[PDB]
Amino acid sequence: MREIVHIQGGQCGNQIGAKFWEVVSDEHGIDPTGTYHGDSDLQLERINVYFNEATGGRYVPRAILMDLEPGTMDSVRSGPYGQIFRPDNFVFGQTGAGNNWAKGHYTEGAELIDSVLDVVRKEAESCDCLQGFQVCHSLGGGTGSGMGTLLISKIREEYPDRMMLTFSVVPSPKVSDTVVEPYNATLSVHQLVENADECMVLDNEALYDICFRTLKLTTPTFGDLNHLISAVMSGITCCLRFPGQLNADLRKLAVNLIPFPRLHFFMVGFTPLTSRGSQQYRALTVPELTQQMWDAKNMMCAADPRHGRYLTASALFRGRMSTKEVDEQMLNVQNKNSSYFVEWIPNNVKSSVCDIPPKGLKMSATFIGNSTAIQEMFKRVSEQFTAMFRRKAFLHWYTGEGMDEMEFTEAESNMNDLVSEYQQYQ
């Protein structure tokens, strides 16, 4: 019916998407061999959104994997639910970028983007009515950021009417993996602010601290982080996949959360996240979900929302519940901490309800917050970018490839104008 085309770039994108197609296959109850094995017929009615029938109930995903190293493809085919992807959707170069936006945006794209454009085109016209695209990638790496943003720009030029979600992990100084993470981050976000519809900012700092303090795991490997991100993405798309008392599609979320075409950077939260040692302390009530949702320690971005103002927000509820308690709870949390919301928009909170909780769960909720405290993170990046660009550190591996320094000046300017307008609305 309404169709989502999933796109995954880079090492981060390939692994989080593997876990994403794992949990979605789980919710539609399809085995790792490709056949339905669920119980109720309620799951069969909305598998067109994510899978296509091939032969004998073989539901294969509508996904495009994209990278430059075969190691990502080996990690794809190694795990379970690694055999259900179509081998024609395993499009992949051979050389590798390796933390280089130039290589990811001018050379490797130049001969990889055409072939992925052929397959994503064949994938797009294979279905009838798109809802849009959903891309998960990174911003620190090269083959994710550069190749991803180039694809995003090119597919938005071809299909300007379809929606677009982008789950991008941003780097933090405390969890600082690469060295040229500012050069790739600034140039990517400068592409996103002009081309992407809306961006869900993620980072590993919040995810590690969440897994320490709220889950209390001793060894938080990547698979757990990927699953939490997967939980968020599944919670986002719950409404197209299942009926409810008040459905909300992605376009319905975009119009209720984007007041200005450049104010589309959200912070995200997911509930419930409790240590399985304390899973019996807590009950399952809407106020119990709300106190964990609006908490600052539960945002998936290293940005204190109490250091700014919520412009708008949206809450997606799953499971049988009572709408009265939902609305009065949102109203109460809006009136109590009244200073942390903006004044010239009343009723900043959009809510939605679908009637199917995720598997093994009884009632869940996903939080999308458009706050003005995201400029602290971009300032946290811009000051590093200024420190590098002052005397051109690491600059030649970019400039000697086809890029000029004017790209860096305009990316600097666009970022500074964005953080200024966020500060203005504060």
């Binding site: 051979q94 993996d177 420190a387 002052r390």
Partner: protein, 427 residues
């Protein structure tokens, strides 16, 4: 994805003699060539049941070469992969660069040309040489020149053996080291320094091997090389390829010089003794008691770092350890680069060689960083070079071989330029 390695000189092929022993032991390849896909980046699988390495040994004296040809690894190495000249260059850059190079280098390059032809997904070249000698310096530089002419854009990882400040075996090694650096600047894309006094202090202090030979040095250097190619070879949680050192650690086209380090260098007894954790090995990889180059980074400022991890390593604790490093102030970074780290993790633990002195460790760290203490190295070498050049000593060897005063002068002022360079960037 493959990488071919070249070994130049008397040092180059002895390091290779220990390095390829490690590769056979890590991929379980018998010394006669057959196993009882991860190996495909080093051992091409000829015919049926036989792997034969992507390597070249070369030298001008046949002694150490046919010692390889008659060692344990007779059937393993291709008969002509090991190249051998007739007579030595004999601690003479000009002799190794103009007289004998002109007839050995052409056979070397039209040999690696068909090595590259058999290869498919070449990452690049990684070289092994010493600059104190003549064969490593002279035709090593001559080869690097013709490599840069032929391919150029392919990376050239250079693990070079500089002369130690105090401990020294030769006399003209200042001249040869200077003349080699003059070409090592604009030819190698990135270079790792390896002194011998630093490694001698390591084996004396940590390993407590009181009287070490070269083979102990070669063995743990091979351990370093294996720890930074483990990413290509095996699957890890976060693998970083060869083109990363190019990007994440070379801020300027003429600043590519890196101090290397390794931890834990621990014998068989201190292993059961010590509780190996990521915090202390990430700490121990920073004190100069564990640097492979005799210098003090206290006097310098770091520019970029890179950390390979092998074994049971989760990104949590490596992230916590580098956080404690960034918050410490005993070491310092330059202000013009805030994010001064790069990580990399591979799953397989480093294996041990029978009769070796290193123990089976759960996890290990190979740190490669850039600093300005290397600017201190070149100054300390240039000072004693001027000492000899003022009196024009030993010059008649080079001039009679074919060179003149110009190359001495221009290499002297080039090292002066590199000096001005490092002092300018460091502040």
């Amino acid at each position: 994805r493959e990488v071919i390695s070249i070994h130049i000189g008397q040092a180059g092929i002895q390091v290779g003699n220990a390095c390829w022993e490690l590769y056979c032991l890590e991929h379980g390849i018998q010394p006669d060539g057959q196993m009882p896909d991860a190996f495909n980046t080093f051992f091409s699988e000829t015919g049926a049941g036989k792997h034969v390495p992507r390597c070249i040994f070369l030298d001008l004296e046949p002694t150490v070469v046919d010692e390889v040809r008659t060692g344990t690894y007779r059937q393993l190495f291709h008969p002509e992969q090991l190249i051998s000249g007739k007579e030595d260059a004999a601690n003479n850059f000009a002799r190794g660069h103009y007289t004998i190079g002109k007839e050995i280098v052409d056979l070397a390059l039209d040999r690696i040309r068909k090595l590259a032809d058999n290869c498919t997904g070449l990452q690049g070249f990684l070289v092994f040489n010493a600059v104190g000698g003549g064969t490593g310096s002279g035709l090593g530089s001559l080869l690097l020149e013709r490599l840069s002419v032929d391919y150029g854009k392919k990376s050239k990882l250079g693990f070079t053996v500089y002369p130690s400040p105090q401990v020294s075996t030769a006399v003209v090694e200042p001249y040869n080291s200077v003349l080699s650096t003059h070409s090592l600047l604009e030819h190698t894309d990135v270079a790792v320094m390896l002194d011998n006094e630093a490694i001698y202090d390591i084996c004396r202090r940590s390993l407590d091997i009181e009287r070490p030979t070269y083979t102990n040095l070669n063995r743990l250097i091979a351990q370093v090389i294996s720890s930074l190619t483990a990413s290509l070879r095996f699957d890890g949680a976060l693998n970083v390829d060869i083109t990363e050192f190019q990007t994440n650690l070379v801020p300027y086209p003429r600043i590519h010089f890196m101090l290397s380090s390794y931890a834990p260098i621990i014998s068989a007894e201190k292993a059961y003794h010590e509780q190996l954790s990521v915090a202390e090995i990430t700490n121990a990889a920073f004190e100069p008691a564990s640097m492979m180059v005799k210098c003090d980074p206290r006097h310098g400022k770091y520019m970029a770092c890179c950390l390979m991890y092998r074994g049971d390593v989760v990104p949590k604790d490596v992230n916590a350890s580098v956080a404690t490093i960034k918050t410490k102030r005993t070491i310092q970074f330059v202000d013009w680069c805030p994010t001064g780290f790069k990580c990399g993790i591979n799953y397989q633990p480093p294996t041990v060689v029978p009769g070796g002195d290193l123990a089976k460790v759960q996890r290990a760290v190979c740190m490669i960083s850039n600093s300005t203490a290397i600017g201190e190295i070149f100054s300390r070498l240039d000072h004693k070079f001027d000492l000899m050049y003022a009196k024009r000593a030993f010059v008649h060897w080079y001039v009679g071989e074919g060179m003149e005063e110009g190359e001495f002068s221009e290499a002297r002022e080039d090292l002066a330029a590199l000096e001005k360079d490092f002092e300018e960037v460091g502040a």
